[PDB]
Amino acid sequence: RILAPIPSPPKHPQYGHLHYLAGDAPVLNFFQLARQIPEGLFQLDIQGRTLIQAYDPNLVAELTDERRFQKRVHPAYTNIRNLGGDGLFTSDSFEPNWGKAHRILLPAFSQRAMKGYFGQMLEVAQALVGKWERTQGQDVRVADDMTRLTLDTISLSGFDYRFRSFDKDELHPFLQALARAMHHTMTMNSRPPVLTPEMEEADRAYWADIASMNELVDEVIRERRGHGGGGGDLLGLMLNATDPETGERLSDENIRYQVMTFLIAGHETTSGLLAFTLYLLLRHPHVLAQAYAEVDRLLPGDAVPTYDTVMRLDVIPRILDEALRFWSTIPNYAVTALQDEVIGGKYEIRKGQQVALLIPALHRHPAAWTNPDEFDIDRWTSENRRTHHPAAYKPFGNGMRACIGRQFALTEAKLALLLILQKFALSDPYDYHLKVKQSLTIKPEDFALRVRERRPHERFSV
Ligand code: HEM
């Protein structure tokens, strides 16, 4: 009926709105704007397109209705698809392989499946601890070692391959190719129309990198299809399992795509979560005290945890829940309007228009979070968790297109933190000033800490 124009900031005489896209992490510019605009959504003019940002909890509830808005590859995930293919992260819902992979892989990513992966997560976590034992007093490169942790973990659980990233500084070539390709993929989302001589060659090396990755994974696949067909890992499951709906197995191409997808979607989200958590614990040390108490309660001496240990945790899970409220590592994923829509009874969203969920602004909206800028893990007890706004906490996405890796991620992080705090006294020698970098994910950059073995008399409990 009587529509309202989506609010829009006044615009700059030289830059228009493009200055909001500048810097190491433009989602933070969007967050400051959101704090100026109480209507809960705003509009920017980016060269040709319209950019819309949404953070009001009720509006986001509307944008979360998969009858009205859905994730679409349409254009925003097109470059990342260069290496994701029609894997789960980079395929449209209507493509048959999405449904197939989804229904095949969900049981493999459920909570009751996590025990099957524990020994693998633990193998990698112990290697991290080993490195930190070996280098006490020297600078720990937190982001870097967390990326090692998560790459090795997802690689071992995904396709039983051990990159041994803590034995050496230099990463395995497969992972260097992954890193290069990921960086270049984000570069393609911008840059100018006419390509200079350096850029053409960079595209050639990019497609070459991708080929080298496809080759390694393909080789593992063929070469598992001869003898065998399943050694517990996710690949072994994708080799046998059929879709209970169509009766079909996944193609070999699509299996490789899923393996690539696990790596794309799993390492910098999870390593980001872990780095941000160590940052937050350094900045809220009473919380860190409570976590040390939990660790000493459950793992006295040099006791090695089981999956049961992880599931008996309380403080550390709630720490992670609140860290994801402050610093959710995919912070600006978007939905697309299926039809012309009207949200808030006021605001028109045309068919095909993207609306980004401004996760930091949503995760901190005063209408949904009391004292939103306060780090408080008691928000996440069973009792208080029940009273949250149902659309104001979306760190693992939404609906059918939600994170399938959530339980893997949270298990991995719980365990890493448990072992780290079991062994190490954390220390901040440089007064780390938080510097956030945005690519596919957000992440603390140039974050160094120091660790020292906890001595026996320094543990709690008797
Ligand atoms: C080993 C760890 C993980 C794996 C294997 C994984 C895997 C995936 C996959 C396959 C998807 C696409 C699901 C679909 O469309 O069917 C997905 C989506 C998503 N994941 Fe994860 N993930 C992991 C960790 C994380 C973490 C730690 C976060 C956030 C803190 C996260 C946030 C998300 C979000 C927001 C989406 C939706 C993305 C969108 O709407 O475009 N993931 N993940």
- Portion of residues in helices? 40-55%
* Tally of structural domains: 1
Main β-sheet, spatial strand arrangement: 1-2-8-5-3
Strand content: 5-15%
How many angstroms does the end-to-end distance come to? 69 Å
What is the helix/strand order? HEEHEHHHEHHHHHHHHEEEEHHHEEEE
- Biggest sheet character: 5 strands, mixed
Kindly provide the radius of gyration, computed on alpha-carbon positions and rounded to a whole number of angstroms: 23 Å
Bound molecules: protoporphyrin IX containing FE
Number of strands: 12
Shape: globular
Count of helical regions = 16
Q: Strand pairing plus helix content: what structural class?
A: alpha+beta
PDB class: oxidoreductase
Keywords: cytochrome P450, oxidoreductase
Assembly: monomeric
Entry title: Crystal structure of cytochrome P450DA heme domain
